[PDB]
Structure 1
Amino acid sequence: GNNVVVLGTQWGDEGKGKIVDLLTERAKYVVRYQGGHNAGHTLVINGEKTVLHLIPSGILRENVTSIIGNGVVLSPAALMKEMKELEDRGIPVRERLLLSEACPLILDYHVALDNAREKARGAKAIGTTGRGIGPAYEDKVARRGLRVGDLFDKETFAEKLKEVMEYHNFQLVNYYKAEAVDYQKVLDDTMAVADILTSMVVDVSDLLDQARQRGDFVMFEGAQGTLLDIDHGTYPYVTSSNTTAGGVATGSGLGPRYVDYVLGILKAYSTRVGAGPFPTELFDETGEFLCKQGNEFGATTGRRRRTGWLDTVAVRRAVQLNSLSGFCLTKLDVLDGLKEVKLCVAYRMPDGREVTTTPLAADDWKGVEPIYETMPGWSESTFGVKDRSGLPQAALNYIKRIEELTGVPIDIISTGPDRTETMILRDPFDA
């Protein structure tokens, strides 16, 4: 299809960035529809490595236009930081980045609150990235946040600015008894760049509508994973955005009947960063491997990630909320050399019931345990293999199993970090 969507089918870090860059060979626009600079994506091309956080994975192709939709919570500081360090690598970011004047702004106070809150909860911290994404979003729904559009008028703006920090300060000090953020500084830094931001501004909803009257290729790029959806995720250990497929229409402005193909990224094993429910979590040696070998460390916080076995019940969930058309299996290579592999196929509830449908909220996952299925692994290696043919029988056997259990095809197999080290059995666009 024409409107393709890429998103994490799990707890994020399945491999989205990679895929979005490999697929943009043939697309015209790439749209980020939610999240902030909490997303941590890693693209590798001939060894050269790039980790974007707020800027879309399409920034390096000069045929694609990267748009930052209204779903995203834009931090003026982060953009600048990112933009500059890329322009220094020969990438003309400004010649190709556009954004929504409706994006809410993340400013220091958000960070202050985000971090102050985490402390308030102590024994129950969510383990957020500390980027102030939560508060940035709250203010949005509380109808008091500042958007990209309000940087235009600067007199009008400082009044507003003065109004929200006042209230935020009041709580920062009196309530958490933390330090206050100075209005004068926040005001300056923002003002320092208002014009740069304001020049990238575009009417996204409408352009995307244009793109379509033409059948232009548009790739939607997800942030975080499915079990982090604020509504459908393991609340309260989630992100503040609808990371699931509906986030696209709300976050970009494109009508829902225009989503043509939704591809879900699947990591082959499981990771979770931050706190929260995780049934198939590996605390033993096998954990250490998957983590060692799969170089599992946060892409934004450098925090080590929890690893565990692939959970087929959670994934059956994401197929469902997401109306996935197809999967893209990543990191199979990270499994070479194990004696055998295992996958969660059903859940044993705290009262004895064997279920195949996930709970849906932190506390309700509390006592559940995984009923795995055991498979012979492979000592042969698969890293860098570019064709179904080079993959050993135990692998293909593992691959078709997943399809069986989910009923969803495996269109792309990923065997390493470099763009080129992939295997496309079916391209989402011409499907």
Structure 2
Amino acid sequence: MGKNVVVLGTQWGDEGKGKIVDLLTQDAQVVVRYQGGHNAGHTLKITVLRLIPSGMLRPNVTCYIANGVVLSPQALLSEIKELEGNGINVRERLRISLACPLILPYHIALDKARETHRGIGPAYEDKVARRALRVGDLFHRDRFANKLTELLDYHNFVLTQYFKQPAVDLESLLGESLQWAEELRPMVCDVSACLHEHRKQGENILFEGASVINGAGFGPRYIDYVLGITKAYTTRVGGGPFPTELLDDVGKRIAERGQEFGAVTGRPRRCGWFDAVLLKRSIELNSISGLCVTKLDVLDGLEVLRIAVAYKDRDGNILSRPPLAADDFNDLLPVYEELPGWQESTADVTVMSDLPANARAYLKRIEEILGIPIDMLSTGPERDSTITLRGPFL
């Protein structure tokens, strides 16, 4: 019997999940995308993949895009064709749920009309409202066209009347969708049934978070281990509350050493100390089994490190979890523990005993505070600069 592993980030993104997933695919026979869309990409060896799991570059791996993914058919076909150019037999090992909702031009438009008071949101809205076109509809061209015209009679009304923005042309959408069914046909399937047959065959399955139960049709007690990818410090891209934010020379050093810059904008990310209050909530929500702590090497050379172990709100109440309401972060302050840093390099160290004593004590304290083990550790950007203390597929 195999093991079923979910991998997700525990903070506010940018936790270094890509190379950890790539490493874990050496042990998986099956990799599953079950949530999200094509918002964030992953760069690897040959090419950026946003919908196709990176397990595709292992010859034995079957990759699944499960029903919880909303997909733009043209974004998917471009990724496919790109990998086909590099000589990957994609269509033999990529499988796509017939129940994926499509992201179409009008979803993107409603996104744009609303931003000025990538379609993923409006697509999920159509799905919840029981009106979304799906992959399976491509195979009934009569129904696809009927439902598309009828959906466009509404979304175009909303776009031009309410938002005073341009409509989406029905005829050009039918024209662009002409080849989608034939392009996707050999890959479409009942993904959940496939996953349960793999489970029956004892194969290892990796669920790659961009929930599993609804998004892949895969019940919760079959999940054997949840790996929480957790950077050794915290970053944030957007505005809003950041209790451990560093606005000084230490934060600037972290940003530089960790290359914490927007991949498209070049804008530096906000940086701050490790925040265990944030992590406690992530562990509870996701029943995280163990952590993969990443970018330890970025902290080399700091004289002291801090860990936020509580928050103190405006009244001086001590909080062990982040407040639900963003109002409560006003006049809210972190409560820190202080640990000594290390001067020795941890870059690309691959055995725990080669780490400096203060680095191991930092990691041990995170384990003590959070109550779950650090089962993996990344000490560099290279896939193999990774210590596996306990394998998630054990």
CA distance in 2, matches of 1:314, 1:102: 34
Matched, 1:188 2:175: yes
Question: Which residue of structure 2 aligns with residue 36 of structure 1?
Answer: 37
Question: Which residue of structure 2 aligns with residue 229 of structure 1?
Answer: none
CA distance in 1, matches of 2:113, 2:78: 24
Residues 76, 193 of structure 1: 8 Å contact kept: yes
CA distance in 2, matches of 1:39, 1:93: 21
2:142 alignment partner, SS class: helix
**Scaled by the length of structure 1, what TM-score is found?**
0.87
CA distance in 1, matches of 2:206, 2:194: 14
Q: Deviation per CA, 1:53-88: give whole Å up to 9, x if none.
A: 111121211111110011111111211222222222
Shift of 1:323: 1.1
CA distance in 2, matches of 1:296, 1:100: 35
CA distance in 2, matches of 1:394, 1:116: 52
Structure 1 residue corresponding to 2:222, chosen from 243, 246, 258: 258
1:332 counterpart letter in structure 2: L
Question: Which residue of structure 2 aligns with residue 8 of structure 1?
Answer: 9
Structure 2 residue corresponding to 1:78, chosen from 71, 75, 78: 75
Matched, 1:395 2:359: yes
Question: Which residue of structure 2 aligns with residue 132 of structure 1?
Answer: 119
Residues 3, 258 of structure 1: 8 Å contact kept: yes
Residues 16, 41 of structure 1: 8 Å contact kept: no
1:212 alignment partner, SS class: helix
Question: Which residue of structure 1 aligns with residue 152 of structure 2?
Answer: 165
Root mean square deviation of aligned Cα: 1.7
Structure 2 unaligned runs (5+)? none
CA distance in 2, matches of 1:411, 1:55: 27
Structure 1 residue corresponding to 2:376, chosen from 412, 417, 429: 412
Deviates more, 1:420-429 or 1:265-274: 265-274
Question: Which residue of structure 2 aligns with residue 88 of structure 1?
Answer: 85
Q: Deviation per CA, 1:184-213: give whole Å up to 9, x if none.
A: 222222223222123210111111111112
CA distance in 2, matches of 1:276, 1:199: 45
2:372 alignment partner, SS class: coil
CA distance in 2, matches of 1:322, 1:264: 9
Deviates more, 1:308-317 or 1:352-361: 352-361
CA distance in 1, matches of 2:16, 2:35: 17
1:207 alignment partner, SS class: helix
**Scaled by the length of structure 2, what TM-score is found?**
0.95
Identity %: 62
CA distance in 2, matches of 1:323, 1:55: 26
Structure 2 residue corresponding to 1:154, chosen from 130, 135, 141: 141
1:23 counterpart letter in structure 2: L
- Tell me how many residue pairs correspond in the alignment: 393
Residues 32, 63 of structure 2: 8 Å contact kept: yes
Residues 40, 299 of structure 1: 8 Å contact kept: no
CA distance in 2, matches of 1:206, 1:394: 49
CA distance in 2, matches of 1:50, 1:271: 25
Question: Which residue of structure 1 aligns with residue 105 of structure 2?
Answer: 108
Shift of 1:287: 2.4
Residues 3 and 362 (structure 1), Cα distance of their counterparts in 2 relative to 1, 3 Å cut: same
CA distance in 2, matches of 1:406, 1:104: 38
2:192 counterpart letter in structure 1: S
Structure 1 unaligned runs (5+)? 121-130, 224-246
